[PDB]
Amino acid sequence: GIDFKLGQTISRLRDISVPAGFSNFEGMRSYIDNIDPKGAIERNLARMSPLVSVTPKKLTWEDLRPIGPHIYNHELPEVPYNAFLLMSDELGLANMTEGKSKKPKTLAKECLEKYSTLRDQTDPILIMKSEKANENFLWKLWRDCVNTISNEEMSNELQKTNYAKWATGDGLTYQKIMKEVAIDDETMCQEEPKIPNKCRVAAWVQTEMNLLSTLTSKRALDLPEIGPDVAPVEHVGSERRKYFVNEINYCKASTVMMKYVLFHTSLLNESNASMGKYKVIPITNRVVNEKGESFDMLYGLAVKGQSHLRGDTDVVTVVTFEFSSTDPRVDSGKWPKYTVFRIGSLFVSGREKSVYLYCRVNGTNKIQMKWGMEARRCLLQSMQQMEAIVEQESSIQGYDMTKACFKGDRVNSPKTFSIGTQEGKLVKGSFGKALRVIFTKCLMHYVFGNAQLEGFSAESRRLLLLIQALKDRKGPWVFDLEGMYSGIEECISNNPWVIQSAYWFNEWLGFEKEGSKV
Amino acid sequence: TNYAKWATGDGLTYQKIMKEVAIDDETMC
Amino acid sequence: MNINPYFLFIDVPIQAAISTTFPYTGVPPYSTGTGYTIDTVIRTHEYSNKGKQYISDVTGCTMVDPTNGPLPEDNEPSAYAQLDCVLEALDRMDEEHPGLFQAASQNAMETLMVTTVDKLTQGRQTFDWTVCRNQPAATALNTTITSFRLNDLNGADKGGLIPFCQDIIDSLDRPEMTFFSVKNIKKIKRIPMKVKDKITKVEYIKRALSLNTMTKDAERGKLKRRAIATAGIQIRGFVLVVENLAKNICENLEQSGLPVGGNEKKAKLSNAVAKMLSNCPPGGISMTVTGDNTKWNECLNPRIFLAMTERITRDSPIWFRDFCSIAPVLFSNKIARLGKGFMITSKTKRLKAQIPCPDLFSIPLERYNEETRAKLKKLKPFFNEEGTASLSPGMMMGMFNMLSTVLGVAALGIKNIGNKEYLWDGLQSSDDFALFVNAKDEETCMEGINDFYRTCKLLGINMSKKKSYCNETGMFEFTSMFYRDGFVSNFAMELPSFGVAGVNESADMAIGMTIIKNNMINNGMGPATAQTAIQLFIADYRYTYKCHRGDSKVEGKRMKIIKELWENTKGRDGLLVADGGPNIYNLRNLHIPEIVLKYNLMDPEYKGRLLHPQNPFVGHLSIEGIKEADKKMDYDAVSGTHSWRTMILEEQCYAKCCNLFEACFNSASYRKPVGQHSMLEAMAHRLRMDARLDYESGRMSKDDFEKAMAHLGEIGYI
Amino acid sequence: KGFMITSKTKRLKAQIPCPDLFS
Amino acid sequence: MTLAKIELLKQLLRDNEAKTVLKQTTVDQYNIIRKFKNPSLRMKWAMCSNFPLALTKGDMANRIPLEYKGIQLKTNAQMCSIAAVTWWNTYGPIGDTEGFERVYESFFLRKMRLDNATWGRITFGPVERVRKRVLLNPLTKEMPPDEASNVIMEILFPKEAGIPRESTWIHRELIKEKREKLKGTMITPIVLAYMLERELVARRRFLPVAGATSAEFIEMLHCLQGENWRQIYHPG
Ligand SMILES: [Mg+2]
């Protein structure tokens, strides 16, 4: 047969890998083979201390308390706007086009040629400088971007490449030295970690959520066609997709998502192509309105730094200048990271409005660059929930329920959802409005996503499920509520979305408390 | 030789930059 | 009006609207991992400080044994699992399943006796000791075999995996160990060459027991990063056999949520909850506890796994018992390589330097930050000079998943303590468990939950009091799937699959479309959702492969050629999407390759052009991936121009030898060759037979026959 | 040769030519 | 070929490395020898590179110019660019298509069943489904994997067929039919072998089924079934 036999080193490793109370593996073998336990668990539990226990405790509405009370503290600073690109304050320089697709450089050149007043604006007017950002460096970089885009050549590399090394901060980098010098050196100490600042609720997140769930005349999301459908199931799927895309196509969140996706596509392509040069990258989008006209929208420019990406997490610096019409002085606490300039003004239909240029230095990496190319997965996340709801409704009544759910049938009334509140009075909204709210929520989970958001969502799932069980009169029990609350609250530090989600959770919990009396 | 570069302090030499960046920088005195 | 998304929950159950709560649309967090590994080691040894501390004479490391230690006196995690309690649980489980341990052991032995060394080529990156790095399974396996050849170890060429494991065990006894090491010789260029290096016995043993560490990347449900461990090749076979035995045992268990995936687990959840509800007494209550074990990898002692394997194989041949008890022993004496060291910087001098692991304590601890300072102060006792941590107690997640599930089901199988008026049972799968307790009043249900908590603590299982809660039966969670009133709201995690998946055009298309079909079948993806997924995948595919519609005015290198093809071919509906052709995939035809779908619609000239029998892009050596795609997934495609494919000296030599072998043996590609002789002898015999057949068949002249025979004689096989 | 300016925190130096003495 | 084979073997043995590896690695170990993190990003980067494709050495490269309409295709350093594939699909060698009409019979039969099938009404009520072991795709003749491999070897590997087992005679009709149909083609034997394995080896899975169980309906299970909807489908 087989005579697999152990040597000496392995035998001695086996000898010293035995639980306490045995001198050799043979002792363990004999003990396990012969000894017959007859309730060792009962004895151990009997002699186990009484202080060790789940300490179960029934959960009631009173035990549930607001999460992250410090967000209501007025001493802490208002959360700043840390998103990569402007979302609700975005300004898009629009030029109508027949539909022909051209390179981003030419598209940006034409867009800037249309707006020559901003293109030729060489004398800036600084409105606010964040803390450190040198206004001179940022303005010189912006002028370099404008000149590089407007130059007749077809190269997309900045014409200086030597001033930009310092304007972007690439030059100010520590230089590596061999380990022995560091050992001998005494001043070289390990850098302390950067603990995120603790902030309070802000009014800009709520306004952004309100604005980005609203219909707009500009539809940007376009998707590839699929093959003809002949079976009933695919016809039903096409109908539901038609309603869903009709609702979501014309919402500002869709345009923001498409802008993000296109910008990240361009950024990743440039990083893959250009390695050792400073690149100019327009923030471009294609937008089609109700009339069918197509426009190219230029939302600013970006300087992509020295893309020497070795691995994936290696950082690449991007200096973004973005057009906007919002005066940051109205809400100063929202823009402590942005060095803005007042670059011009324009008339939309005869009403003049100023145009500021928000300049900010940020960083990205291959993971973020790619995952910004998959923001349509937010669209699928939105689709799944509405599909589930419509399937439930059509399960209740035999005939398909989509039309009544959205527009209303001759036998059923349109379905509505509790959308928000005003003056403490909750308000209702159509199914399309709830769809847009869900889409905006998913888009914000994408844009404002980081470790803090993942932790907060995962740990607040417990609270949501507990509240759901409490609603169903299931009498949920929690063994240690304060530990769960602390775990949830340790993630409410700096992410604007996490703080606003905590505020919304507290508001909804209060409303549930008030309505639970019935 | 690498160790002697830092032991003698020759490695702690200030970098030279263009006049344009320096004048555009307010922290250079 | 202020929009509040949470108000949706007022109109919809949280379970139904739970999909939108997942932030699986953003960027997953990504990571030096040395700090995380140090926290892991400190925490693992902190839960077991009250055990027995000694010195490993074999390795000289500091070992800690919490098993059979003092019982816990508080609510912190404890690894002091009593052996006799575990034996009691195993005996009860075996009684409940007559002849299950024996059958699983015998089946594992049977499947082991037929396994070959080549099976070790499966899996993920493994720790290569010859270079002390992370190398693919096949590369590390062949490197270890070649190095064994130098130290007089000839088991791998014997075929079966038993001789290879025997020679691995023997390698731990040889006074020295010779192998090939990479030498980056300076010449300026850094040329990598092979150096015949030699190491001593203790260092080689430490290398064998070492478990390389890395920082997790794909985790998205936590705000902090943890450490994953990759083992070497000296343990992969033993761990494979033990895991196979554990899977054999836990396949029969009804309480086990493994090995099952897709829709089977939903049915298991529903069946378990229905069975529990039916068994509920008249007038009693069934409470369901949604549980989530704390870490639970750092409290499972490998010695408990050794005892469990010993008890499972009580009536097996001694050789199989010893073979099965080699992974746990090599785990109880494991060593953790602590990342790549820290980084210290001088701000005033604008300098930075990485301090490698071996010299962590060469710097006074006052030069580390407070967190790292305390970490190193606590880690000093278990720090090896070479730059590794002696991590005996606890386990690294991912190694023993089936065995730990068996332990959890053993805990669940107790069903009662003190004959009290309650019965508990539930589901357990790889750190995720759910419980159900039937009693007469909620007070007794909570008493049963407390008893279960204490019993689990006695076995080393520590369930979170923060991550777990309880309610009435009919609503709970398990492995991220939410059950509520019979409607299993299978969470939506299907996002990280819609997008080009790798190797090439046809394979990516087939993989994506089969993914859509599988999601529709299992997770209940709807028609509209599937169509939207197809649309998004088409968009991503067209962008990535630079293959847009011909009529579209997009500009690019391949776009000009696609534009020319658009009008150069009359039938515009037969071209693949790879060539800018229109998409025909819909809900009904997601199981059929697109080449065959448009086959009727292709112009004869176009199909002849694309489907040429000989294609330089398609290489016989690149067909390995036609069957399976990396998890191993099967996809159906059609060979064509789009089936293309995207150390140096060894690569050339091997590749060429394998290509010549494949050319001589046309069946080697399709089926695995079997033979205990050198490749040269088989190749020479095949060539001689082919030459004789060709000469006898009139396909080869007498002069060529003489030339070939002279060549073969020169080779030395006449 | 003009004058010289330097930032210690950034460890940078530059030379300002005579014409740029007032810029 | 035999002269070419012996010449290649002699040229290979001329190197010490080839000699040692050939004389040291056994036939069993050959598998390991033939085996030498984020596929999405790597493929993305490869796509925009000048020459991502690894073109095998051969005589077909001469058919495609290195540059075409000012677009680079191939270099002599082989490496190739997707533009070469697109041109090949535009203009290039015209192959023999009769092989596909018989080699890829499973897919063609799948398409025929899809095309000639008739659909009906859709019911949106809750659907009762049961976990059952079902065969995903229809089989011409199912047999155990070892017997399937033996049959495929006997089909497309006439040599290496010494001492026929007690399986060729059982499936003699299948053997002769496949031998006759597969003749006249030139596709690589690996693709044919894998296709025959797919045709012969049965793939079964635990799936939720409500109604028809035959593989014809299982193929379209993704469209026929539904958690809260059902469809009537008659395969062609
Ligand atoms: Mg759970």
Residue numbers in the entry:
A (entry chain A): 199 to 716
B (entry chain E): 359 to 387
C (entry chain B): 1 to 31, 34 to 189, 201 to 643, 652 to 667, 681 to 752
D (entry chain D): 353 to 375
E (entry chain C): 1 to 36, 43 to 83, 91 to 249
What does the paper say about this structure?
Cryo-EM grids made after mixing apo-FluPolB and hANP32A show a majority of dimers with a 2-fold symmetric interface, which are quite distinct from those of FluPolA. Several different pseudo-symmetric dimer structures were determined at 2.8 to 3.1 Å overall resolution, almost invariably comprising an encapsidase paired with a variable partner. The dimers have a 2-fold symmetrical interface, although the peripheral domains of each monomer can be in quite different conformations. The apo-FluPolB dimer interface involves the PA-arch residues 375-385 of one monomer contacting PA/332-338 and 361-364 of the second monomer, and vice versa. In addition, the tips of the PB1 β-hairpin of each monomer (residues 360-363, closely associated with the PA-arch), interact with each other across the 2-fold axis. The core dimer interface buries only ~2200 Å2 of solvent accessible surface compared to ~3600 Å2 for the FluPolA symmetrical dimer. The apo-FluPolB dimer interface involves hydrophobic (e.g. PA/F335, Y361, W364, I375, M376, V379), polar and salt-bridge interactions (e.g. PA/D382 with Y361 and K338, E378 with K338 and K358). Even the core conformations vary due to different openings of the polymerase. We used the split luciferase assay to show that mutations in the symmetrical FluPolB dimer interface significantly reduce self-oligomerisation in cells, suggesting that this dimer likely exists under physiological conditions.
